[PDB]
Amino acid sequence: TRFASVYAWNRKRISNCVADYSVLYNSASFSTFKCYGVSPTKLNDLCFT
Amino acid sequence: CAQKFNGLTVLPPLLTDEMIAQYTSALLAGTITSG
Amino acid sequence: NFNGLTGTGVLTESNKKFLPFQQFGRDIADTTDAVRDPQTLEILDITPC
Amino acid sequence: QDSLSSTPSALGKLQDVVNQNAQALNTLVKQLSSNFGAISSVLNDILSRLDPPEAEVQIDRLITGRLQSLQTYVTQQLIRAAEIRASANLAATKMSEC
Numbered sequence: 239t240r241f242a243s244v245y246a247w248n249r250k251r252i253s254n255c256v257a258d259y260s261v262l263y264n265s266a267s268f269s270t271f272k273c274y275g276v277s278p279t280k281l282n283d284l285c286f287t
Numbered sequence: 288c289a290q291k292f293n294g295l296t297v298l299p300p301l302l303t304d305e306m307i308a309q310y311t312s313a314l315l316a317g318t319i320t321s322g
Numbered sequence: 323n324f325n326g327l328t329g330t331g332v333l334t335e336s337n338k339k340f341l342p343f344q345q346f347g348r349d350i351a352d353t354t355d356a357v358r359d360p361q362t363l364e365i366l367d368i369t370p371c
Numbered sequence: 372q373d374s375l376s377s378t379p380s381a382l383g384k385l386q387d388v389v390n391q392n393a394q395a396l397n398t399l400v401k402q403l404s405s406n407f408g409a410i411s412s413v414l415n416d417i418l419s420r421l422d423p424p425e426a427e428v429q430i431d432r433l434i435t436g437r438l439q440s441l442q443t444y445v446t447q448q449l450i451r452a453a454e455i456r457a458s459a460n461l462a463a464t465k466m467s468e469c
């Protein structure tokens with residue numbers, strides 16, 4: 239419901255779970271979706287610490 | 288082993304060590320018996 | 323593809339004595355030559371085809 | 372018979388050749404661990420992460436570095452080979468004359 243100011247930006251740590259990134263990428267609701275160091279179509283194949 | 292795994296191989300000598308020893312002993316026999 | 327680690331080769335049972343924390347082994351070329359299977363916790367050797 | 376059996380350094384000239392060649396190969400293999408400016412030294416990491424345009428940039432960096440490493444190796448082997456050939460020519464001369 240509430241987002242932070244940019245100077246006081248929030249951070250959430252995510253771990254020990256299954257991440258489906260296609261539900262976000264294939265959404266019609268986001269004006270910007272830009273990936274660096276990785277391609278969005280490959281995110282579902284990857285594992286991160 | 289791991290060198291092979293990266294495209295690095297070793298080719299065997301045409302003459303084996305046994306064959307080289309045979310050449311050497313032939314040279315020795317020649318020298319000893321016929322100068 | 324072992325927990326994100328991809329490659330090609332022949333897999334076999336290993337005699338390598340991994341400690342519980344260890345997940346994989348490496349050679350001098352920085353290539354993984356052994357992995358722990360994430361489900362069975364079995365140690366496997368990886369050799370090229 | 373007795374001297375060779377009690378002198379660890381007797382065959383240094385031959386051992387040095389073995390050691391120099393081993394060192395050159397070990398160096399060549401170790402260069403595969405270098406990034407050369409790429410995101411990873413591992414080609415499979417690059418291909419699993421990036422699409423072909425961005426991937427081609429990272430791969431080109433590895434190709435440049437790895438080609439340079441191989442050229443360095445080969446040049447050194449050619450120079451070393453010449454030295455060995457000179458030694459072999461001398462050995463052949465001694466076989467004939469001694």
Ligand SMILES: *[C@@H]1O[C@H](CO)[C@@H](O)[C@H](O)[C@H]1NC(C)=O
Pocket residue numbers: 360361362
């Ligand atoms: C799930 O993985 C764990 C090891 O992390 C293993 O002990 C367990 O038996 C696995 N469950 C199934 C159904 O394979």
